[PDB]
Design an enzyme around this catalytic site. Structure first.
Site, mmCIF file in Angstrom:
data_model
loop_
_atom_site.group_PDB
_atom_site.id
_atom_site.type_symbol
_atom_site.label_atom_id
_atom_site.label_comp_id
_atom_site.label_asym_id
_atom_site.label_seq_id
_atom_site.Cartn_x
_atom_site.Cartn_y
_atom_site.Cartn_z
ATOM 1 N N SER A 1 33.940 62.122 58.146
ATOM 2 C CA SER A 1 33.676 60.771 58.562
ATOM 3 C C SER A 1 34.814 60.403 59.502
ATOM 4 C CB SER A 1 33.701 59.904 57.303
ATOM 5 O OG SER A 1 33.272 58.604 57.589
ATOM 6 N N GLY A 2 34.525 60.063 60.762
ATOM 7 C CA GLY A 2 35.571 59.678 61.755
ATOM 8 C C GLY A 2 35.656 58.166 61.957
ATOM 9 N N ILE B 1 30.423 67.058 57.201
ATOM 10 C CA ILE B 1 31.696 67.506 56.638
ATOM 11 C C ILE B 1 32.786 66.454 56.740
ATOM 12 C CG2 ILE B 1 31.173 69.924 57.087
ATOM 13 C CD1 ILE B 1 32.945 69.896 59.540
ATOM 14 N N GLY C 1 31.830 57.398 64.089
ATOM 15 C CA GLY C 1 30.880 58.493 63.871
ATOM 16 C C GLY C 1 31.344 59.685 63.036
ATOM 17 N N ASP D 1 46.173 55.069 63.250
ATOM 18 C CA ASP D 1 45.550 55.342 61.954
ATOM 19 C C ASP D 1 46.139 56.592 61.289
ATOM 20 O OD1 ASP D 1 43.847 54.584 59.834
ATOM 21 O OD2 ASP D 1 42.086 55.607 60.679
HETATM 22 N N1 LIG Z 1 37.096 71.281 57.743
HETATM 23 C C1 LIG Z 1 37.158 70.571 58.991
HETATM 24 N N2 LIG Z 1 37.340 71.182 60.192
HETATM 25 C C2 LIG Z 1 37.403 70.464 61.346
HETATM 26 N N3 LIG Z 1 37.606 70.946 62.677
HETATM 27 C C3 LIG Z 1 37.278 69.074 61.236
HETATM 28 N N4 LIG Z 1 37.307 68.347 62.365
HETATM 29 C C4 LIG Z 1 37.253 67.022 62.247
HETATM 30 C C5 LIG Z 1 37.187 66.183 63.461
HETATM 31 C C6 LIG Z 1 37.723 64.916 63.597
HETATM 32 C C7 LIG Z 1 37.478 64.161 64.752
HETATM 33 C C8 LIG Z 1 36.607 64.675 65.749
HETATM 34 C C9 LIG Z 1 35.968 65.955 65.555
HETATM 35 BR BR1 LIG Z 1 34.696 66.886 66.780
HETATM 36 C C10 LIG Z 1 36.266 66.673 64.409
HETATM 37 C C11 LIG Z 1 37.010 66.413 60.983
HETATM 38 N N5 LIG Z 1 36.913 64.981 60.879
HETATM 39 N N6 LIG Z 1 36.944 67.157 59.836
HETATM 40 C C12 LIG Z 1 37.086 68.505 59.991
HETATM 41 N N7 LIG Z 1 37.034 69.270 58.853
#
Ligand SMILES: Nc1nc(N)c2nc(-c3cccc(Br)c3)c(N)nc2n1
Ligand SMILES: [Zn+2]
Length: 286
Positions: free
Chosen positions: A16-17, A14, A20, A127
């Site tokens: 991209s960080g 779902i 990871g 960022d």
């Molecule tokens: N729709 C949704 N929900 C979330 N909670 C979410 N969380 C993160 C996220 C970011 C960094 C670390 C972590 Br674990 C989760 C992400 N990139 N996208 C996300 N998208």
């Protein structure tokens, strides 16, 4: 049928960080969806536990996601967080890549506060970008969350408040598109730079696009960014957007920003435009 130990079952990617990817998960006992990040324990430099620590320090802050779990499980370090709604980039695309002034203003208030709270906890984000802001779910659908502390850094000691030293010759951290001018010049990032980036993010939302989009590459954006005066960039939009940027660019390295002043600029403009403070964003109007 991939399972994070006993407790969670993995789903599709779902997100991209900075370090990871993020997967959709289920907590089987709860009957509940979550967001899951994995790191191989063999990774050369591990930051997942480091980044979780930051989130947990921030916990209780408005618009900070909650960590359900951090630990080691088999050959992975695992972070599970509460599931949030779509990012501002996602929503931007659903709104034909143009936000109404009302939506931009409503966003800016919250986004400035998020950045201010993180600064109060002795960190800079480094960022700041539309992908790193997410809407909440259900009763929190009106709340802007800030995510991703992978590039985040402590700018002052917690007890003494000793600010980090000025340095130069730094490699760019973060997205070039929203980076501050000083960041492009290799200066150590500080509080000013989070706020300057937020300025480019707001103008991006007003314009649909920045003049340094769609043009070796890093020097080329830096040039165009330094070649485009603020007045030129912000022409045809309320003067507050230029005033915001000029203030941020005035700030010296270790200066504390005036977050109230910057919020007030946009609050006054909000009043003069006659908008309802009803948290009805463009995407709710779809
Ligand atoms: N729709 C949704 N929900 C979330 N909670 C979410 N969380 C993160 C996220 C970011 C960094 C670390 C972590 Br674990 C989760 C992400 N990139 N996208 C996300 N998208
Ligand atoms: Zn941990």
């Amino acid at each position: 049928e991939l399972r994070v130990g006993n407790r969670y079952r993995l789903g599709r990617k779902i997100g991209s960080g900075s370090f990871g990817d993020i997967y959709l998960g289920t907590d089987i006992a709860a009957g509940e969806e979550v967001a899951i990040k994995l790191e191989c324990v063999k990774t050369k430099h591990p930051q997942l536990h480091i980044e979780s620590k930051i989130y947990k320090m921030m916990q209780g802050g408005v618009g900070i996601p909650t960590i359900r779990w951090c630990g080691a499980e088999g050959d992975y370090n695992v972070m599970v967080m509460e599931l949030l709604g779509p990012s501002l980039e996602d929503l931007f695309n659903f709104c034909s890549r143009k936000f109404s002034l009302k939506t931009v203003l409503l966003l800016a208030d919250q986004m400035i506060s998020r950045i201010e709270y993180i600064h109060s906890k002795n960190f800079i984000h480094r960022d700041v970008k539309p992908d790193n802001f997410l809407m909440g779910l259900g009763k929190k659908g009106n709340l802007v969350y800030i995510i991703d502390f992978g590039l985040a850094k402590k700018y002052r000691d917690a007890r003494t408040h000793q600010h980090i030293p000025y340095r130069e010759n730094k490699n760019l951290t973060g997205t070039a598109r929203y980076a501050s001018i000083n960041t492009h010049l290799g200066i150590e990032q500080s509080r000013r730079d989070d706020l300057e980036s937020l300025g480019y993010v707001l103008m991006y939302f007003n314009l649909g696009s920045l003049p340094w989009q769609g043009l070796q590459k890093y020097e080329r954006i830096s040039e165009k960014k330094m070649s485009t005066p603020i007045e030129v960039l912000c022409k045809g939009y309320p003067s507050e957007f230029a005033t915001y940027l000029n203030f941020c660019r005035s700030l010296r390295f270790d200066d504390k920003p005036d977050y109230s002043y910057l919020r007030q600029l946009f609050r006054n403009l909000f009043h003069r435009q006659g908008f309802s403070y009803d948290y009805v964003f463009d995407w709710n109007m779809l």
